[PDB]
Design goal:
The structure is cut from a larger assembly and holds four copies of chain A (438 residues). Chain A is α/β, with parallel strands linked by helices and 438 residues long. In chain A, 47% of the residues lie in helices and 10% in strands. Chain A folds into three domains: 279 residues, Alpha/Beta hydrolase fold, catalytic domain (Rossmann fold, 3-Layer(aba) Sandwich), CATH 3.40.50; 85 residues, Influenza matrix M1, N-terminal subdomain 1 (Influenza Virus Matrix Protein, Chain A, domain 1, Up-down Bundle), CATH 1.20.91.10; 74 residues, Orthogonal Bundle (Arc Repressor Mutant, subunit A), CATH 1.10.10. Chain A has 21 helices and eight strands. Chain A has an eight-stranded mixed beta sheet, sandwiched between helices. Chain A is elongated. At the A-D interface, helix 5 and helix 8 of A face strand 2, helix 1 and helix 6 of D. It is classed as de novo protein.
């Protein structure tokens, strides 16, 4: 999986990325000098929680292309933008690490937060690393950073082992927090990067982000270890906390720089606690929107009120048995068969506790579609567009074109254990079919 | 629905026909001067029994074309042949009436009985109507038939009422066996025929069928009323009985010529009793053939023996509950999921007593087809060819081309209350999918 | 080289694969946690033997994509089917290893053996690894496999060193059968796999293949090690041998799990012996089918019996003098000049006795083609079609759609070393020219 | 970035290549068994000097495809030819190492020197490694190389740690000239290559390059380590020096075989010096012939002396400003506008120090000339031909068949937006224009 972001000479600067899981998109940006695979402990906990994980490799690092141009944060942000535009992500979360936090703060400032719901800064560079007469809160003068760039160009392979010692604090963490095999992969990941990228990237560490911080309007999370070597805490996060008081501030006690692996228990705990508090407001907004499209089919009366509460208890998570429900749903005087099917459909997508034994006939004949071959031949063409679809905003848009007949049969395909798509796009088909009946 | 059988000048001699029901094809041939609609009392009882009824209108009569050529039994038989070839009927039953019996005996003699399982002769012309020095068993000399032909050409409309009096014996049956409204339709049917056909057809009544009778090798039924006017019983059926002793002989007591309507209770009773005795031998031959394809998937052992008896009791009609069966079918050690589905599929097609409430998941996931969009897109193309298919010999032939993957999903379409086809072609898909696993 | 076998979100699940050599397609399926390059010792042996090696990487492993969906043998077999269909293979031999033996039995029991000639099971998973009350032939209970997954999730990179120590039995083979450099490479491939793929794979180890074994209607090979630490021989091959007795059972003495590298000498010898014992019956009644068309051109007499022995004493595997035949075929009274070049061509392919010098003249003047540009331009048309051909039938079905004069010129280039084809393709041309003389 | 250079059955043979920087193209070809990333020190100095660095990985090595066919220098040269043509490199430089030095001599011999300006052989194989009876100056008999292939086939990975041990002289240069980590990565690059490649490549070492040496008609550079253990200097560079005495000969004292890393500070110094001289000679040789053509358009007198000086001063790189020239050129008594537009078009090319400013106005007005409907549209016909033409003589020959009104108009197109083509092709138009107006 590759996304093109640039064009160097006769080649195209392509970036490696991975799009896993279904739900709220969480974009992860790695640090120097690793790949997107470095988030393998965080990506694990984000998948079990239900989030959609998207990790991409920075140019010159990992499996991405290795050009000798475009090594400033204006290019690094222009790449992140192209990725978000190509993926068409909406209300996503940007989580950065090391250099990754430098793109999270630059993109937000330069392109806005129309696609952003929340951000996070793990072991950040912000606001400034370079120590000048202007900024005393710097970590080191430019002579120091020029000492690193030269030390890479001499022998970048021998430079890595020294760097990955101040990355994990191996004299304290090896054999306890991190194994030597785990370290080896990090070296293998770094050594398999672009030689030019390894020598040009350190010149971006001392970037002035003081102008980009105020442009953060979305909820933010700031995290940093108290034993960081590459990025001293009192020169970064401690003074990042004063620049943006709106963000929650978390110091992991005794954590090194590469705290993504060493303190995975601590990081994942805080990262999930932040997301489930800053995304809860929008994650249920669909549940009341899906409820809206569903209720716009039910004829007004005593039924419409109880049905709406059979959606409230279910969407929330209250215990509801289907047998009393589905029986009751069938024997209805004013409900047309087609609505019985949609309700029977939605009531199965939202609960994993249907006992997994029986199916219903009143819905199965409702989501039939008469049995017309042409009507079925279009329904599978929709499912084809839905099996390669991800978002609710996209599944509804596509399934609003096809006729009301093909929509019924397409819902049947998913319901009759034939086709299979995520519950987020399943609502899309439902809410699109509901707009047809309006 | 029309079938072309000839070509007159700038027009094409097309014949009207109707193909209703599913099962053993029963071709009905009307008499003079009606349409295929005259069998509406017989077609009713043949549909409730489960037979497939096919009624076509003779040339110059009914809604068929009205040419002024081809009015001999060599042309009338050549039309019946073309119809059977176009419809590709196999092991069908030919049932004739009045002139209709003249085509049943001529086709069999001139074209054979490869497509014929049994025949019937209701109020037949056989073996000879014309009284000559050669044949004393005739009904009338040629002077009589020439008296009718002239009486038609004078005023065929006024000739009908006289004919439809000796057709039903209205002085005995009107207001009792047949209503005057029922008679009116017969007149309307006759008057809406070809004027040339009404005047040329009587010249075919005195045809010598004595050479065609010995060529009857299939089981035959001979029926005739004892009050027939148009065709005296002692000149037709009584001497037809001596020519072909193999055929069962039935005299309806006090029945007129048009005994298809007057004595519908008697005719239908004898007609069904004959079919269910002369078709029982082949109607279950498929049941042991379908059983053969089904058992060729089951791994040899103690299961294969019991499964085979779960097919014997079911195909025969013995009481079998699905809940004990389907539960038992699921929890199987050596049965692969795909075979569980086929058995679960067949066990639902053959019994109308599944209580109509629940469905099974072990089969529903077996006849899935992985969920591949291309695999589903081909499955609906098969169902399209099956929804316009009629025979078991044709459904199997078509569903042997598509891959084993598309066959599974196509079986799912029928099982999951989406598509709908007759149980005769359903076995075709099953037996074709079974040959794939061999 | 890649093959799209699915679609996860906005990414396409592609599998890495390689295709070398000419002859019978031998597919090699690796196991946990290596890749297609682990067969490198077997691939070198199969290429020299005269086969066609096709190795591919499982999803999430090796150089293929690393998705989070589709980690079960129903999905693994769906990929294998797509690879087999995309390449359009016929008479293919399926060889598996560890986790790769499960894809061989699952595909063979769901998609058929149309493209399969034989199968092989090295270090099998069959028939059941999980130990319940239903079978004592299981390896370990569910509580054990949960320990593995938890160990992978803890430290994926540290898990390998403890896994590869029991993979090759390094307390027995290190420094002898396998060097530490070979271990490091096996680790480098396991580390570059998928993070989700490495933890969701051991849950597929205890898959039940008992319902897939009787579906194997092709010659099989059950090989195992008597010192396997990962897959206990008593719980796998020992009971697999009873479920599949007509399969050549081979136990490599003192062999570990990673016997592909340690006991490569013992495996290759046993694998090549099976590839000959299973494919000998098909080469016979093909080589005699080749001879059948060859002897047809030979006039029925005392010469058609001599040339029969001159062929059957070469097809068997014996050696002979090329000079003797090319002087006994040259100076011959009854044979036409064309059928001299034909026999001279068949011999030049079936003989290993090169003697290392110059190439005959009379066959050149026979397979000349009159030096006609039109007839010789049609000759290169077949060569381009035969260079892309594989089977014997595929070559004969194309080389029969050309003039017999053009086939001579086409057998000229292949002879004159201006064009190169295989063995079954070459005979497909010759046995087509022979068909055009009847 | 990949380039297709062939086809292997179901798979395509692609080669991984990189393109960096702007300037004179320098093709770097690696050796056994590394990849293009082995030039990461030479590819650094070349970029800092102002060259265009192009590294491609040989088949079976690096990230390129791993086929089992075409492991010979006839195929390797074809691979290089395909890469050069696909990239359409003009006046490039070929630099090879170990095996790469064989692909330089073979290309020039078989394909020519139209795209090549200069070549370089670093630690070369030339002329013949195999020690035969007619070639006393060999290195080892065929019994030696056959021992290496056998050594690799036994254990490919364990073989490397002994090869790299002498490749770098790690008993002399380890932890000093080359780091331990630098070795490990080179081992990873080796282990990630084609298994068949590592066994087939050593057989290509003893290739006779004596048939390729005389074909070299371009400036060459023969550099070789004095302490080369793998490739003896006395059996290669010394004898190679006699076969091509025209080449600048350089011996780096105490350098092993892998002197690209250990002695990068010496190789970069020599390679840059050679390039900055040999290329400088071509930029002077084929620049004084331009003056010859220009000084045929200018009437004899002081203007044929003042322009001559101002041309020879500019050609010599003497610091001057165009605004003195471009104005002094304008206010000139004798010269016509056409020859005032030609001179200005040369001064813009031969003086890169353009103050970083605009173009001129009088040259734009004089160049187009008339803008004749067909003659201006016959300038775009030549513009399509010169973009494909690669040489100076080639550009001269084609444009000599066009009118001076078309050449001037074509020069007007190039001047506006250049370019596309190169200066060696642009001068091919200027010299052709001057040749016409005579």
């Amino acid at each position: 999986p590759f996304i093109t972001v640039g064009q160097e000479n006769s080649t195209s600067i392509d970036l490696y990325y991975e799009d896993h899981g279904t739900g709220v998109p969480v974009v992860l940006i790695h640090g120097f000098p690793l790949s997107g695979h470095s988030w393998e402990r965080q990506s694990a906990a984000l998948l079990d929680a239900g989030y959609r994980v998207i990790t991409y490799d920075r140019r010159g690092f990992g499996q991405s292309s290795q050009p000798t141009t475009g090594y400033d944060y204006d290019t690094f942000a222009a790449d992140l933008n192209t990725v978000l535009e190509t993926l068409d992500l909406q209300d996503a979360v940007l989580v950065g690490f090391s250099m990754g936090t430098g793109e999270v703060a630059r993109y937000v400032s330069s392109y806005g937060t129309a696609r952003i719901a929340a951000v996070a800064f793990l072991a950040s560079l912000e606001p400034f690393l370079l120590k000048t007469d202007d900024n005393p809160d710097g970590a080191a003068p430019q002579e120091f950073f020029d000492g690193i760039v030269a030390a890479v160009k001499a022998d970048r392979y021998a430079f890595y082992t020294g760097f990955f010692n101040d990355f994990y604090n191996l004299d304290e963490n090896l054999g306890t927090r991190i194994s030597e095999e785990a370290v080896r992969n990090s070296w293998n990941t770094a050594a398999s990067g672009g030689f030019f990228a390894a020598a040009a990237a350190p010149t971006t560490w001392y970037t002035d982000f003081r102008a980009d911080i105020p442009r953060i309007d979305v909820p933010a999370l700031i995290l940093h270890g108290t034993g960081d070597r590459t990025l001293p805490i009192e020169n970064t996060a401690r003074v990042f906390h004063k620049a943006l008081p709106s963000a929650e501030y978390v110091e992991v006690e005794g954590a090194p720089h590469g705290l993504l692996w060493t303190h995975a228990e601590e990081v994942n705990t805080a990262l999930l606690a932040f997301l489930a508090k800053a995304l809860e407001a929008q994650k249920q907004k669909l549940l009341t929107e899906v409820e809206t499209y569903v209720l716009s089919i039910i004829p007004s009366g005593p039924l419409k009120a109880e049905i709406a509460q059979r959606l409230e208890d279910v969407f929330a998570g209250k215990n509801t048995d289907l047998e009393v429900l589905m029986e009751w749903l069938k024997t209805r005087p004013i409900l047309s068969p087609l609505t019985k099917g949609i309700l029977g459909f939605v009531f199965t997508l939202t609960v994993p506790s249907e006992r997994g034994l029986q199916r219903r006939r009143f819905v199965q004949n409702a989501l039939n579609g008469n049995g017309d071959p042409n009507n079925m031949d279009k329904a599978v063409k929709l499912y084809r567009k839905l099996k390669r679809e991800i978002t609710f905003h996209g599944a509804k848009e596509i399934s609003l074109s096809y006729s009301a007949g093909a929509l019924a049969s397409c819902m049947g395909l998913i319901y009759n254990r034939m086709g299979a798509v995520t519950t987020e796009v399943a609502f899309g088909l439902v809410c699109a079919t509901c707009e047809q009946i309006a």
